């Protein structure tokens with residue numbers, strides 16, 4: 001059973017790898033409907049680098065070696081497009097570092113290319129060096145959109161919460177591996193203004209802060225609180241840094257605890273028609289916005305991780321409720337895949353969806369699915385933490401729903417409406433996180449235990465970045 005399911009995930013991943021190599025490699029990604037290529041990530045081959053940690057875990061040496069040969073030829077100092085510090089960090093930087101830790105440890109005997117392996121760190125060093133000038137600002141809070149050749153930017157006055165708060169894991173990890181503390185220092189300085197929020201009006205509830213920070217002085221510029229896009233991974237990394245080195249980041253852990261508790265006390269929300277369902281809402285100067293995103297479903301998995309590590313049954317319980325809410329958005333549609341955004345405000349329910357809202361508990365705002373993994377991710381933590389089979393099965397139903405709805409001759413495509421036969425229409429798009437996240441969590445849920453699997457209590461020896469790349473925990 002489980003062995004056959006794991007093998008079936010490997011097949012789906014292999015299917016996409018073949019089409020990508022066939023029509024697009026070395027470009028960043030495959031365009032799955034026209035069987036062509038695109039470069040949404042600066043042209044360094046994002047799908048190939050993102051695919052590395054997953055291939056190593058699945059045991060596909062051919063795929064690993066092809067990727068290792070490709071890394072050696074990349075020139076991170078050249079690109080014809082503007083650069084996102086955040087995306088470049090969570091996909092490229094973390095993808096090479098994870099491969100190195102995986103190949104230098106639990107997977108040492110997978111290939112003979114020690115020289116190409118060593119180069120994964122060398123290239124990680126070079127990428128950080130080309131990017132670091134982004135941090136050289138008054139406060140230390142960076143510009144997320146830079147031009148790596150002129151050193152110019154988009155002229156922004158503020159930098160977002162998530163884009164500022166989701167770099168410390170990979171940047172600190174490079175320092176611990178090279179011995180050059182500059183990376184750990186630059187990223188931690190930017191992270192500092194987020195742990196000690198100012199003005200106080202920008203921290204409406206303990207541990208929940210605004211969505212923008214002035215690059216000039218480090219002060220927040222708004223008081224909007226949320227776990228949706230723009231904010232999300234900031235809270236995610238607070239706890240994960242504690243798992244990385246509980247010694248050095250006990251303070252991060254303390255800031256996450258406050259955030260978790262204020263969220264249970266204020267952001268928690270139950271739709272009027274479906275009181276047994278739970279979602280998180282947004283908050284702005286006393287008003288609660290009752291809508292969420294697929295992205296936000298990463299939330300249950302964070303509560304479950306902080307829950308088992310800190311032996312807090314109340315966080316584990318709250319996490320499972322968020323998992324149920326997200327499962328609900330999935331099994332309520334025709335394809336069995338959930339929507340990008342939705343709402344549950346009794347005063348705004350669309351008349352055409354009246355019937356649907358009444359039974360499911362929500363109304364759909366954007367019915368597309370861009371091959372995202374946030375829900376499978378959290379379904380994966382619930383199964384690892386509780387040990388219940390129901391969560392493993394929910395990962396399989398989702399995986400199968402995607403394979404039948406999104407698959408094409410070359411790979412998988414995003415779709416326009418999860419509540420229409422075949423998903424409406426397919427988008428000519430396949431993001432690299434299809435290889436990094438969708439295929440890794442689906443596989444890990446049915447595969448054998450190992451060091452890279454998420455663990456209970458304080459037993460974790462690896463810690464996943466936001467793009468599903470596992471990093472060896474410090475010392």
Ligand SMILES: *[C@@H]1O[C@H](CO)[C@@H](O[C@@H]2O[C@H](CO)[C@@H](O[C@@H]3O[C@H](CO[C@H]4O[C@H](CO)[C@@H](O)[C@H](O)[C@@H]4O)[C@@H](O)[C@H](O[C@H]4O[C@H](CO)[C@@H](O)[C@H](O)[C@@H]4O)[C@@H]3O)[C@H](O)[C@H]2NC(C)=O)[C@H](O)[C@H]1NC(C)=O
Nearest residue numbers: 276277317320323324325326327328329331332386388390
């Ligand atoms: C489509 O999507 C829906 C919505 O998510 C799925 O239904 C949910 O399924 C989960 C998983 O079983 C349900 O969670 C479990 O609910 C049990 C019953 O809870 C009711 O009764 C208790 C009485 O004490 C009340 O407290 C509670 O408010 C409810 O009224 C619980 O007993 C379960 O907890 C036990 O197991 C967990 C581990 O899984 C432990 O942590 C607990 O300590 C305890 O041992 C668990 O909470 C959930 O209730 C369902 N939600 C809804 C809204 O129905 C469907 O299954 C899915 N359909 C398909 C096809 O998959």
Ligand SMILES: *[C@@H]1O[C@H](CO)[C@@H](O[C@@H]2O[C@H](CO)[C@@H](O)[C@H](O)[C@H]2NC(C)=O)[C@H](O)[C@H]1NC(C)=O
Nearest residue numbers: 079080081082083146147148149150151152153
């Ligand atoms: C990044 O900055 C460089 C500036 O060095 C921009 O490149 C210049 O673009 C002008 C526009 O025609 C050319 O005439 C120059 O010859 C270019 N200079 C060099 C050395 O290439 C580039 O446009 C910027 N990139 C982006 C995406 O805005």
Ligand SMILES: *[C@@H]1O[C@H](CO)[C@@H](O[C@@H]2O[C@H](CO)[C@@H](O)[C@H](O)[C@H]2NC(C)=O)[C@H](O)[C@H]1NC(C)=O
Nearest residue numbers: 005008009011012015399400401402403404407
């Ligand atoms: C994922 O989709 C693939 C392709 O649609 C499924 O594999 C096909 O299965 C049919 C029988 O149902 C075979 O006749 C084809 O030869 C298979 N295609 C290929 C190229 O392998 C696959 O079963 C689906 N995965 C799961 C777990 O349902």
Ligand SMILES: [Ca+2]
Nearest residue numbers: 298466467468
């Ligand atoms: Ca993520």
